[PDB]
Design a protein around this nucleic acid. Structure first.
Ligand SMILES: Nc1ncnc2c1ncn2[C@@H]1O[C@H](COP(=O)(O)OP(=O)(O)OP(=O)(O)O)[C@@H](O)[C@H]1O
Ligand SMILES: Nc1ncnc2c1ncn2[C@@H]1O[C@H](COP(=O)(O)OP(=O)(O)OP(=O)(O)O)[C@@H](O)[C@H]1O
Ligand SMILES: [Mg+2]
Lengths: 100, 50, 53, 202, 367, 48, 247, 246
DNA sequence: CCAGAAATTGGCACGAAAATTGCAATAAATACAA
DNA sequence: TTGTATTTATTGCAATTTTCGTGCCAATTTCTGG
């Protein structure tokens, strides 16, 4: 499956996603430091056999958390600044998000 | 059979006091190896296993 | 009239199939096709593959 | 690991590092050794009862006429098999004693230096446990894989390393030579395959 | 030459924490075995009896193994090397401060009744735990705030890709299909040995050379024919499914091998063999060539609707339902009927199961 | 400090424990050199 | 399920248990209808080749002229009309059991062709120059006294000692009077279930008549009599009148 | 691995050794189970053709109408269905040994077909015009009495003198009474090892019982009896009770 | 609140249609010797 | 001028196994009147 850029990362708290807009991209004018999330992305981990422990995990917590793994872009350590510009390049034939 | 001795035996240091160099016999080369390489393939690229 | 095994000169109408050869290459994927091509290269001295070395 | 070579191959360090150990040990010029190794000329192993020396360099037409005249009375070969046969049939003690007698009797300056060098080389070979035919490769060692890793790059491309490419070339040539030898292929092609295997190993 | 560097996995981090922990020799061996038994999600994969057997000494009881395991479970991240989900959640909750508003209720729910929460009862659970709906919502929210997979904090690895065989692109307003030139196999006849075919040369070499030359020519022709057949079949398939590449699924057409076989004038066995383990790259993604063949059901107008479109419609309808009252298969069937799709309840249940979607009673929330 | 794989770990543990002592071993690069020389068809080995 | 109650049948069963670890040829002898095929299939089931083929072959239905081609096979150009290679029965049952049923009807010319294959296990096809080696266990069944045939001269002496490594003889039903009533009850229940009748058992006089009759067809004749009695019954019990076929 | 202890069976071994330098055909006669196959393979092993093929052929298992095709081979186009040339058994066994097992069951029509190949080694393939010459040593074995059959008239006279250059007759086991006990011990050890039992000998009564039975199947019957005794054995010594099958 | 009624789900079964796998030499065109 | 040996051009049929949709019903969950 294809990687998706999204703000719905299952394993992170609500505070870390405060600076991302509805499309999963940081706002213009945000002050960021090392370890902050700039673009949220998930990678399809793939199908499994769905053993009863995995079924229990999916039933109790959810299905989104069990199908994708976080692969976001983060600020490198020892780097800070203000977000002044964001550019989005999309392949022809792919649907554009709201930011684009 | 004891795990302590098994783990301790792979952390030892060899003892030596000299270095020897010479020509290698075909029998010596065969004694070094653990198997014969027959195919030029490296990675399956499908299962990503050797 | 009789059931036996014999050697004789007869005049017969004969049917025969003609399909099986080169049809196995269609089902193979690209990797298996390359492996089979390498195996064919090993045995045939007159076959070569393009190289950049 | 190891690779079983279909035919013997000379070690380039003991051939192309001046002074040539193989040439100085066999008392042959380096040009003749190179010509014999890369399947360009013949060399006599056993002279027989004919007028042929034990290290005489022949050519294709000379070998053909020698065969059509004498027949099965002389043995001639080309490639690394001939060099290994020459190295395997030498007796070091007799060579050493004859060279020492010649050095004691004859007096010169350049010949003195040459005989001294060959005597020292032969006595070094005798004193150590090495044998001359070990300078011709029959089994090829293979380095452990973790010392020659593959390069992983973005997009799922592993590419390749130089050492792995050289190993692949050697293995391909060896396998083709094995298949050609076991099929009784014509000699005009197997000679070219042996030359290419020698070049790949070098 | 860049040789690459070393990375730290979960087990490397756990062993680093083990080495700096005041363990004895036997305790360190037990910890080594336990850390070896931990998988990438942070859960223990073998029973403690296997670890005790692997220690190899008869002087050691299971209680010492339990103590070492409890000590290891407090490493970073907390909850690693847990036996099951209940143990992991209890370990995580044990480290919370006592001032948390709903620690006790969450601990009670996790320790006693975890199957009811998994089955989405929300009715028998209230009776068993004697709680109201005001506190149950907060307790469930606190439970859902924990980490079910503590071992993914040190996640390592890389995705694996696939090289397509045919490329589809929209040029000049119409879709065009070509072969991927980076993966197309090709051969060539060695001109040296081929030109060695001298008539004056010995016949024994000449017959060998001629036979091998004709075999090489036959093999090259076979490869060319295979490539041409693959290109023709792929182009025909893309031409048939032309509305899919412009609007995705829900617009698939129902087609079988007979349609393509009639279109390209070949046998169904050839079409079956060609479209095996071969991929196609489109602006939408990478699809196997067998992805475009599907069954169908009837339609009120008189036409046919593919099963892929019905699965997509079912997923869309389920994903946009009311969490208070989830849709059942009878309700899903009556929603697809207004569009004229004549499908049975059992087929809708089969489609829902194929998408790995729980039944209606197990999807309801506590909103 | 560079390539004694066991020595690095032991030194780190001793430093954290407050014991400033080392147990040096063989550098890994010398083992790599030995393997590389052996791959050339030359028998090089350690004595005693 | 089968019924073994007589002491002789239990002794035969114990022998079958004991010889379960061997791969020797077995020769089964008896009268008609004693249960030779039952014993052969039980031997196959209790052996190490339980999941392997059990090729049962009637050696009297193979034509004389094509006898070799049926058991050994032939290559492509063995004779006129041979189009493709084909295996025999010794190669079809490789790794399993071959059951030669009614071996006493084989003519001497046909018996001479089975000499080397039984012991060696190796043979050549018809038109093949490569030796085929197989691993087949030989069970043979007959209802004629093989020893008497060998002494008379109607059976080859070289084959009896190859086949008769282990010999089992099944006694007639006339000597197994402890085994008659259970068989009658078994067949009665089977046929009552099959035909949906209402019979349940035999009267005491009927039991006496059944036990006193010198059965010549053995279990097959008993089964036929029970089936006829069930078919023509009308009452709850099968009295002496329904068994009017017996004299 | 074979047992040769009787005085009659050692003269045969000496005679086999003495003919190691010969290439004449050999004819082996006896009863059934005496060991004709053992003697034939020992003759082959102790000769100069030790590494050469040993083709054992049951001459009674070849169909009547394809006898020549099997023995000599055929060329392409010889008959309808001959799509390629195929060699025979005389070419298959070229340079080695051909063992015609059970030669006594060959019809008079089939005996006249191999009348020139035995002495000359030259023949023509079916549909072939060139003459083929082979170098094969012929061993034949039979349990009949070939001389008596020739006297009767059901065996060809011209074949007996082509085959019987050297004649070896193996006495029955009932007369080689020095071999019964060594053979019994050999077979007992073999079968005890194979079936993983604990038997290691016979009692005195069992030995006295094995020395009086008139073995009709000879060594094969003895082997069968020992195998039955081992399979049904219980203790460590085979008593007379286990040998009631005699 | 309780218990009977009703709706829901999935394992098994049925026929029908669709996909998969075994089979191995010929038809015809063209250049060459009388 | 022709009859014949050699070289390109043939990428299907026929069983057999597997998957499709949809009905029956036992077990389970949800609903509603007294
Ligand atoms: N002990 C038994 N229990 C149940 N049924 C039995 C038993 N013995 C024999 N039979 C039945 O007897 C019938 C005839 O027996 P079977 O087929 O073995 O005959 P047979 O010995 O091969 O005869 P024949 O020599 O006439 O071919 C079979 O249908 C079989 O089921
Ligand atoms: N001297 C011996 N030592 C050991 N085993 C022997 C000896 N003689 C015969 N045997 C055994 O006796 C068995 C029968 O022998 P063999 O096959 O030679 O008998 P045959 O009837 O003469 O041969 P065939 O009928 O096959 O031509 C074989 O298993 C063989 O091993
Ligand atoms: Mg029967």
């Amino acid at each position: 499956g294809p990687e998706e850029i999204t703000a719905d990362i299952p394993n992170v708290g609500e505070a870390a996603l405060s600076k991302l807009d509805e499309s999963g991209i940081v706002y213009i004018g945000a002050e960021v430091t090392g370890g902050d999330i700039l673009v949220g992305k998930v990678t399809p981990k793939g199908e499994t056999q769905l053993t009863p422990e995995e079924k229990l995990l999916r039933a109790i917590f959810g299905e989104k958390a069990s199908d994708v793994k976080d692969s976001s872009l983060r600020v490198p350590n020892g780097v800070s600044g203000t977000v002044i510009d964001v550019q989005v390049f999309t392949r022809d034939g792919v649907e554009k998000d709201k930011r684009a | 059979k004891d795990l302590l001795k098994f783990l301790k035996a792979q952390t030892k240091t060899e003892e030596f006091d000299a270095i020897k160099i010479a020509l290698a016999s075909p029998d010596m080369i065969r004694s070094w190896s653990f198997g014969e390489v027959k195919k030029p393939e490296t990675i399956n690229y499908r299962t990503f296993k050797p | 009239m009789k059931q036996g095994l014999q050697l004789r000169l007869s005049q017969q109408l004969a049917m025969t199939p003609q399909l099986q050869q080169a049809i196995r290459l269609l089902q193979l994927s690209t990797l298996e096709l390359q492996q089979e091509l390498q195996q064919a290269l090993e045995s045939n001295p007159l076959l070569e593959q393009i190289d950049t070395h | 690991g190891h690779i079983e070579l279909a035919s013997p191959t000379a070690h380039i360090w003991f051939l192309k590092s001046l002074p040539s150990r193989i040439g100085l040990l066999l008392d042959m010029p380096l040009r003749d050794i190179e010509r014999v190794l890369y399947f360009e000329s013949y060399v006599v192993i056993e002279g027989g009862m004919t007028n042929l020396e034990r290290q005489q360099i022949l050519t294709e037409e000379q070998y053909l006429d020698a065969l059509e005249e004498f027949g099965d009375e002389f043995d001639a070969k080309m490639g690394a098999e001939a060099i290994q046969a020459l190295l395997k049939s030498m007796d070091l003690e007799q060579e050493c004693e004859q060279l020492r007698e010649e050095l004691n009797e004859t007096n010169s300056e350049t010949k003195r230096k040459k005989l001294t060098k060959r005597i020292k080389l032969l006595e070094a070979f005798v004193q150590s446990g090495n044998k001359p035919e070990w300078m011709i490769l029959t089994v090829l060692p293979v380095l452990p894989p973790d010392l020659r890793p593959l390069v992983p790059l973005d997009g799922g491309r592993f590419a390749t390393s130089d050492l792995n490419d050289l190993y692949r070339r050697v293995i391909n040539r060896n396998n083709r030579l094995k298949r050609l030898l076991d099929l009784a292929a014509p000699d005009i092609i197997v000679r070219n395959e042996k030359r290419m295997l020698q070049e790949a190993v070098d | 030459v860049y040789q690459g560097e070393t990375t730290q996995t979960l087990q490397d981090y756990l062993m680093w924490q083990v080495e700096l922990t005041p363990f004895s020799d036997t305790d360190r061996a037990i910890a080594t075995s336990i850390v070896d038994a931990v998988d990438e999600t942070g859960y223990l994969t073998v029973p403690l009896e296997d670890i005790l057997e692997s220690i190899g000494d008869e002087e050691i009881d299971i209680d010492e193994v339990e103590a070492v395991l409890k000590r290891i479970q407090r490493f970073d991240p907390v909850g690693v090397a847990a036996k099951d989900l209940r143990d992991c959640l209890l370990i995580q909750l044990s480290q919370f401060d006592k001032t948390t508003p709903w620690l006790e209720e969450a601990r009670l729910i996790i320790s006693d009744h975890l199957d009811l929460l998994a089955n989405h009862d929300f009715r028998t659970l209230m009776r068993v735990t004697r709680l109201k709906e005001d506190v149950l919502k907060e307790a469930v929210n606190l439970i859902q705030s924990l980490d079910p997979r503590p071992g993914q904090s040190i996640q390592t690895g890389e995705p694996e890709y696939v090289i397509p065989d045919v490329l589809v692109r929209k040029h000049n307003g119409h879709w065009t299909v070509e072969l991927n030139s980076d993966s197309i196999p090709r051969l060539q006849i060695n001109q040296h040995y081929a030109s060695m075919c001298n008539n004056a040369r010995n016949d024994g070499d000449s017959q060998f050379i001629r036979s091998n030359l004709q075999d090489a020519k036959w093999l090259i022709k076979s490869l060319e024919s295979r490539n041409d057949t693959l290109l023709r079949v792929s182009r025909c398939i893309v031409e048939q499914q032309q509305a899919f590449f412009e609007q995705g699924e829900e617009y698939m057409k129902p087609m079988v091998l007979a349609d393509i076989a009639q279109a390209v004038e070949m046998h169904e066995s050839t079409i079956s063999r060609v479209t095996t383990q071969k991929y196609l790259h489109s602006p939408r993604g990478i699809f196997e060539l067998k992805y475009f063949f599907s069954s169908h059901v009837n339609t009120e107008g008189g036409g046919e609707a593919s099963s892929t479109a019905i699965r997509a419609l079912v997923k869309k309808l389920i994903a946009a339902e009311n969490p208070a009252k989830p849709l059942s298969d009878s309700k899903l069937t009556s929603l697809l009927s207004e569009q004229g799709i004549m499908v049975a309840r059992r087929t809708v249940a089969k489609y829902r199961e194929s998408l790995s979607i729980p039944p209606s009673n197990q999807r309801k929330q506590l909103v | 400090k560079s390539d004694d794989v066991n020595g690095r770990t032991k030194m780190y543990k001793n430093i954290v424990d407050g014991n400033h002592q080392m147990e040096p071993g063989m550098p890994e690069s010398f083992n790599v050199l030995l393997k590389e020389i052996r791959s050339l068809g030359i028998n090089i080995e350690l004595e005693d | 399920e089968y019924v073994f109650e007589s002491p002789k049948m239990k002794e035969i069963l114990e022998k079958i248990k004991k010889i379960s670890c061997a791969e020797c040829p077995v020769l089964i002898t008896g009268e008609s209808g004693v249960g030779k095929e039952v014993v052969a299939r039980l031997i196959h089931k209790l052996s190490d080749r339980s999941k392997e083929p059990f090729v049962a072959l009637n050696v009297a239905s193979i034509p004389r002229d094509i006898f070799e081609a049926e058991l050994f096979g032939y290559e492509k150009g063995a004779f006129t009309g041979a189009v493709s290679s084909k295996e025999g029965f010794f190669e079809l049952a490789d790794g399993g059991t071959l059951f030669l049923d009614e071996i006493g009807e084989l003519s001497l010319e046909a018996q001479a062709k089975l000499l080397r294959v039984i012991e060696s296990g190796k043979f050549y096809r018809l038109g093949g120059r490569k030796e085929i080696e197989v691993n087949v266990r030989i069970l043979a069944a007959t209802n004629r006294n093989i020893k008497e045939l060998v002494k008379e001269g109607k059976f080859r002496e070289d084959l009896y000692y190859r086949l008769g490594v282990i010999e089992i003889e099944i006694p007639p039903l006339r000597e197994r009077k402890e085994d008659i009533i259970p068989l009658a009850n078994h067949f009665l229940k089977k046929f009552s279930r099959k035909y949906a009748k209402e019979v349940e058992g035999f009267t005491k006089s009927a039991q006496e008549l059944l036990l006193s009759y010198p059965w010549y067809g053995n279990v097959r004749e008993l089964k036929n009599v029970i089936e006829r009695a069930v078919l023509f019954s009308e009452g709850k019990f099968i009295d002496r009148g329904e068994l009017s076929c017996l004299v």
